[PDB]
Design a protein around this ligand. Sequence first.
Ligand SMILES: N=C(NCCC[C@H](N)C(=O)O)N[C@H]1O[C@H](COP(=O)(O)OP(=O)(O)OC[C@H]2O[C@@H](n3cnc4c(N)ncnc43)[C@H](O)[C@@H]2O)[C@@H](O)[C@H]1O
Ligand SMILES: [Mg+2]
Ligand SMILES: [Mg+2]
Length: 326
Amino acid sequence: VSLAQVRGALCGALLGDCMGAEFEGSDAVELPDVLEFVRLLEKEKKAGTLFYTDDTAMTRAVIQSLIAKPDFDEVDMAKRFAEEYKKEPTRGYGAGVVQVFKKLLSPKYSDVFQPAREQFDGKGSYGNGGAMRVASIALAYPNIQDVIKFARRSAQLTHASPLGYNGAILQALAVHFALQGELKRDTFLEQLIGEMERIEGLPFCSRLKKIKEFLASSNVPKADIVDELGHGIAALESVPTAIYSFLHCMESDPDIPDLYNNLQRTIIYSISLGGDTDTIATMAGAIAGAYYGMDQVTPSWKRSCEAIVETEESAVKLYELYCKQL
Ligand SMILES: N=C(NCCC[C@H](N)C(=O)O)N[C@H]1O[C@H](COP(=O)(O)OP(=O)(O)OC[C@H]2O[C@@H](n3cnc4c(N)ncnc43)[C@H](O)[C@@H]2O)[C@@H](O)[C@H]1O
Ligand SMILES: [Mg+2]
Ligand SMILES: [Mg+2]
């Protein structure tokens, strides 16, 4: 695993969040809007015109916890989540998860997992908020067993439903396997299916099997992807879609100009799917970034993003943590 890959993953996550943010929840977004957006963005004279959202706010909190406590400290991490919320509450947090932060900030809970368990009448959140921030677990911990147990724990601080935390594990594993050289598309899916069959044993495996079917077809319409995989706030309806976006964009897409590289193509395609665009693109962007590396994060794109320099600095620190774990 190279510095290029860790850098790529975090910068890809940042780009996906920043670029996807203006379209999130849009019923009307289609590819022409996204292509226009990109060509305008590339000519913007001022840097830093795209602000990040909760997806990145929580990512940065995860990273600062991993650097402060590299053996993984869920109490430290919970505190950083709640304090980040308190400091910048308008970044775009889910309507449910705010109550978790409020309870963590209160004196009443000793068990930092207990607020999450109380969400949605004790069923817990099945939102994608655990998955949107989880990439860095795969960037800090080379051992897959660590990736799984820490992805799960980091997610369970807000997402107590298995759909929520298994979605976070799935996203962490997709980044993990993308880091392993440049696996062939079919090997990558086989790796993910193998792991999720064990973990769920099966909603996420079902979606991964559909993905295998889609990848074996040609010219699959957006509507079929949306209808079968989803583009929603639920982890089940967003994490597989992000994985699909990444795997699809390993090859040319006839509607996206081939002057865009694979990572750019992945982000554009993700956003073009509509729905939860900042989170699907932040997840697909983390996976693509880990896979292709920083070579595909172009200067005109990355300069557009709030906190790019801090993000690059944090990628160097995560890389050193990863190397130390070896
Ligand atoms: N929240 C948004 N965007 C909405 C607009 C934001 C607006 N601009 C603002 O500033 O307020 N995006 C971000 O949140 C998503 C991830 O949310 P997370 O999973 O962290 O949130 P939460 O746990 O609150 O769940 C989200 C919603 O899912 C439904 N839900 C979840 N579990 C449920 C359950 N067991 N039963 C019923 N409903 C459940 C609820 O509708 C929750 O409010 C990302 O997209 C991020 O970008
Ligand atoms: Mg957001
Ligand atoms: Mg979102």
